[PDB]
Design a protein around this nucleic acid. Structure first.
Ligand SMILES: [K+]
Ligand SMILES: [K+]
Ligand SMILES: [K+]
Ligand SMILES: [K+]
Ligand SMILES: [K+]
Ligand SMILES: [K+]
Ligand SMILES: [K+]
Ligand SMILES: [K+]
Ligand SMILES: [K+]
Ligand SMILES: [Mg+2]
Ligand SMILES: [Mg+2]
Ligand SMILES: [Mg+2]
Ligand SMILES: [Mg+2]
Ligand SMILES: [Mg+2]
Ligand SMILES: [Mg+2]
Ligand SMILES: [Mg+2]
Ligand SMILES: [Mg+2]
Ligand SMILES: [Mg+2]
Ligand SMILES: [Mg+2]
Ligand SMILES: [Mg+2]
Ligand SMILES: [Mg+2]
Ligand SMILES: [Mg+2]
Ligand SMILES: [Mg+2]
Ligand SMILES: [Mg+2]
Ligand SMILES: [Mg+2]
Ligand SMILES: [Mg+2]
Ligand SMILES: [Mg+2]
Ligand SMILES: [Mg+2]
Ligand SMILES: [Mg+2]
Ligand SMILES: [Mg+2]
Ligand SMILES: [Mg+2]
Ligand SMILES: [Mg+2]
Ligand SMILES: [Mg+2]
Ligand SMILES: [Mg+2]
Ligand SMILES: [Mg+2]
Ligand SMILES: [Mg+2]
Ligand SMILES: [Mg+2]
Ligand SMILES: [Mg+2]
Ligand SMILES: [Mg+2]
Ligand SMILES: [Mg+2]
Ligand SMILES: [Mg+2]
Ligand SMILES: [Mg+2]
Ligand SMILES: [Mg+2]
Ligand SMILES: [Mg+2]
Ligand SMILES: [Mg+2]
Ligand SMILES: [Mg+2]
Ligand code: NA
Ligand code: NA
Ligand code: NA
Lengths: 272, 48
RNA sequence: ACCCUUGGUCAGGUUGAAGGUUAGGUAACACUAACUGGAGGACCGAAUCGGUAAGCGUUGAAAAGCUUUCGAAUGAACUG
RNA sequence: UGUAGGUAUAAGUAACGAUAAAGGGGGCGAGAACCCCCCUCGCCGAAAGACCAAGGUUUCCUGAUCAACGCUAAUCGGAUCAGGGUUAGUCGGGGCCUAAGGAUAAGCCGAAUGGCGAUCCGAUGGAAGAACCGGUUAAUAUUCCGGUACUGAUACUGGUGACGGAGAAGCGGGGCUCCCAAGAAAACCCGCUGUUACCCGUACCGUAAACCGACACAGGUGGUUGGGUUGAGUAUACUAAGGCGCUCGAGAGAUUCGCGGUUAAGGAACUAGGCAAAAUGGUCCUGUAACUUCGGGAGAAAGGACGCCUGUCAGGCCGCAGAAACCAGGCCCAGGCGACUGUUUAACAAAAACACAAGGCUAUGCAAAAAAGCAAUUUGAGGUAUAUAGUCUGACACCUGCCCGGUGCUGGUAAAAGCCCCAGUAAACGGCGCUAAGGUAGCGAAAUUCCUUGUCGGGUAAGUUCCGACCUGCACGAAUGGUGUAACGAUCUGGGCACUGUCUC
RNA sequence: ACUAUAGCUUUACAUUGUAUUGGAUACUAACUCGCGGCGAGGACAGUGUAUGGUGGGUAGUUU
RNA sequence: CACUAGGGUAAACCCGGUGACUGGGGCUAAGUCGUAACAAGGUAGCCGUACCGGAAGGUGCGGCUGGAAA
């Protein structure tokens, strides 16, 4: 859900934030968190390689189990928690073996439920199965690209993918982007869609919230000088010509995916 | 108004001290040139 | 100038968001009134940060200041 | 406009560095406005008093000295010379631990010099194993001494550490609550009767005459404390403790300047412009319009009371004045631009410029695209299309027309790309007069109109500015957005009331 | 504007092999990647030399 | 000293008037452009709603017969 702020101030007139109605705990698990350092977009030589990054609230990293290799060990869902590092919520799991882990919280997973991973697991929401064992037509998320490497594909809040058909060693999956592509049937996926689908309805309301989230102001190229940007210069306002970056890379329709990439053999239909 | 020199002994030694000069090939070049000129004050480490 | 890590500072007053409780009200939610609550790049205003307007200074007390006036002052704040 | 050294001229001139301020009596001395003691006066007093840190480095105290330094003199000095002065088992640091970052191992990269790369280094953080009271010096004191104490050595694999913001609360006599932006690491620590006590700092200045500013410079400099009356207050005024009268004076009282005070009658006539000044100002009680995004506008505007005494709000008393001094919103009507709080040309521009929340388009299926780097490698991001990046527009409301002809972009030779051709793409650049299409809505003498002070209406005695209309728009026009828009503005611009040396003068 | 050039892109040779049916398909052993040998690719890709395009991103200049 | 008619002030309301400019309507003739409806009026008509056109109007979607032909 979402909470719309009343317009007591101009900086709150257009502000919509989440209702936090799924969170059941406020403190993270101590053994699964660690303090995280920030980069200002600076690489190991100290040079700013990525702009518009800096400041923001201090954050701690949560260890998410994207691999889920504890096959056949049932786990109990303990809490649903806020994670500052991703748009979705996370879930705390207690294994009957006595381990603890964090997983991406799927839509519909409630505190007190049971989850399992591996081939013998029932295809219920929250369970992790090899794609060879998932019934065709199931809504899935957290899709592995290579077997054993961990989920990479469908992870953002509200996002989901679909298993459309299977063709032997490969299954066919439709992506959030609308791409249709082939995935090895020994790769793993989790049943259900990622929760917190109302994350897209939130509005910051003011510049201060972007500063809290750790973004820095972005300057348009047409209001610079020619020495700084190809689109800068002129007396008064000017359009800047064909849109391009500081290095002259066209910004309208020029494709940048490598034309000889091997993975294009597994991509049936493309969509960006 | 605030002027350009704001003293700090730790920063002075970290930036221009003897060990800072010896840590780099160009710093040793500076030391060799100063010895060849015959400076009585080799680095800021010599000052007090 | 920007960033990173670790610390510190912000007299006093005002306003009164969400939420809650109590009465009425509904098939039930809604919804009305009182009390409570204490949010906010909210208000007035010291420290502080900045530098609007005028006067003065222009071999100056100062290689950019002073006096009055004025902006911000829980934050995109200031500062070691 | 040559160079070094020396010496002139301006000239016994500018100036002697905050307008907090001095007067007298004694002392010493060859010499006294200034030195020492006393009395009186004045200034600071959330400091101009008292402390910690950075920085300085003997400036600390005493005896001699007055050449130079001290913007005057000096018997004086933060000055010259000599002597003296800093005392720790418990204070501070270090020894221990790790952050950013740095140096490295195995390895990786690379004409060379070398560049990377997980254990070590590295506080601004975490541990430290551990007191106070009193007295004493010219100069040190939790260190010396007298008591009173305490601490450490020595001879008889799961928890903690471990963490945010805001608010309530415990003459006469800490936890708690709420919130979203979700709040270090490692050591460590848990569970599983003597005999000794090492090292470094310790003086002095420290909102400053000792630090940064060439100066004994009206500037800058992190943290703590900061009495009384007045007050909401750390504001303001006065004043204890404590500290100061700012290292040139004396006369005189022209012009003129600087900082202030008063002003008859008039009251913006001043001026580019009400610039500056004046005016408003407190608490409580009444009462508050257009418009609106329903929050606001709003402290709108406009009124009334206020001292002292007595009596259970009334009766009385005094003054020109009861907010008593200091302190302490001017208000209203109407336009342009920009939604708003912010940012910017250190040193002539604070704005309508930048940013902004938000919208669109495009790229990107993850060794992602993209950005740094010769590379390794790193950022992106340990994020995964509700994500990241490039680019334009800039809250919101109603909306955002026509053109793919041109230019971009996307598709289908050495020993195949391209190019062609065809198709697509305007919230791509661009255009909206024979053509690709010949400007839709909405605006319009406009931040755009040359002619031009266009014409008409309003406002004034009089209006090249302003507001409302008209439309032959030199040369508006829909995301280099069109037209509006409540709130907001040290913005630009017009008119009123208040008020006044801005002006008559 | 003239002339170069980083980068990007095309093809040939090298790295680079085998079989079937040449022009494609298939294979695994070069080579690449993932998980701790196994899995996924595969003579492609990447890299070197040569070569044609593109290239105010950068440079030297002229006007 | 209260009480009050009347006076001044401000506001706000109500009732009227006028105003550059800018919009419908009625009536009379008939200048101009078309032919929308009345016959299946030459695309059956009408109702609601939306968009668009010099105008009558056109088109989309649903409805009705107060429509022929069948
Ligand atoms: K921008
Ligand atoms: K350029
Ligand atoms: K300061
Ligand atoms: K000359
Ligand atoms: K001391
Ligand atoms: K008068
Ligand atoms: K005048
Ligand atoms: K105007
Ligand atoms: K019906
Ligand atoms: Mg510019
Ligand atoms: Mg122009
Ligand atoms: Mg504020
Ligand atoms: Mg102030
Ligand atoms: Mg304020
Ligand atoms: Mg000369
Ligand atoms: Mg003269
Ligand atoms: Mg002078
Ligand atoms: Mg003089
Ligand atoms: Mg002081
Ligand atoms: Mg002394
Ligand atoms: Mg002496
Ligand atoms: Mg002298
Ligand atoms: Mg001395
Ligand atoms: Mg260590
Ligand atoms: Mg002392
Ligand atoms: Mg000073
Ligand atoms: Mg204090
Ligand atoms: Mg006080
Ligand atoms: Mg004061
Ligand atoms: Mg007068
Ligand atoms: Mg005049
Ligand atoms: Mg003024
Ligand atoms: Mg603005
Ligand atoms: Mg502002
Ligand atoms: Mg300037
Ligand atoms: Mg200025
Ligand atoms: Mg713009
Ligand atoms: Mg605009
Ligand atoms: Mg005028
Ligand atoms: Mg006008
Ligand atoms: Mg445009
Ligand atoms: Mg050039
Ligand atoms: Mg040359
Ligand atoms: Mg007809
Ligand atoms: Mg018909
Ligand atoms: Mg049509
Ligand atoms: Na100190
Ligand atoms: Na020191
Ligand atoms: Na005035």
């Amino acid at each position: 859900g979402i909470r719309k702020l009343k317009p007591t101030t101009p900086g709150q007139r257009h502000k919509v934030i989440g209702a936090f109605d799924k969170i059941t705990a406020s403190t993270p698990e101590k053994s699964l968190v660690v303090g995280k350092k920030k980069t200002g977009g600076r690489n190991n030589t100290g040079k700013m390689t990525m702009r518009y990054i800096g400041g923001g609230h201090k954050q701690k990293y949560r260890f998410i189990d994207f691999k889920r290799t504890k096959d056949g060990i049932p786990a109990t869902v303990k809490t649903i928690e806020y994670d500052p590092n991703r748009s979705s919520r996370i879930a705390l799991l207690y294994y009957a073996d006595g381990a603890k882990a964090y997983i991406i919280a799927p839509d519909g997973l409630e505190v007190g439920h049971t989850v399992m991973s591996g081939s013998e697991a029932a295809p219920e929401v929250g369970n992790a199965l090899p794609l060879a064992n998932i019934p065709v037509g199931t809504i899935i998320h957290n899709i592995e690209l290579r077997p054993g490497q961990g989920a990479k594909m469908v992870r953002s809040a509200g996002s989901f993918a679909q298993l459309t058909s299977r063709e032997g060693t490969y299954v066919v999956i439709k992506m959030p982007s609308g791409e249709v592509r082939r995935i090895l049937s020994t790769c793993k996926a989790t049943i259900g869609s990622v929760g917190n689908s109302d994350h897209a309805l939130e509005k910051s309301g003011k510049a201060g919230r972007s500063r809290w989230l750790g973004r820095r102001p972005h300057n348009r190229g047409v209001v610079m000088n020619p020495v700084d940007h190809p689109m800068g210069g002129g007396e008064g306002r000017q359009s800047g010509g064909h849109p391009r970056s500081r290095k002259g890379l066209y910004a309208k329709g020029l494709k940048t995916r490598a034309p000889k990439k091997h993975s294009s053999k597994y991509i049936i239909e493309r969509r960006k | 108004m605030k002027r350009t020199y704001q003293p700090s002994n730790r920063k002075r030694l970290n930036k221009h001290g003897f060990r800072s000069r010896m840590a780099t090939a160009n710093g040793r070049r500076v030391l060799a040139a100063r010895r060849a000129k015959g400076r009585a004050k080799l680095t800021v480490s010599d000052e007090f």
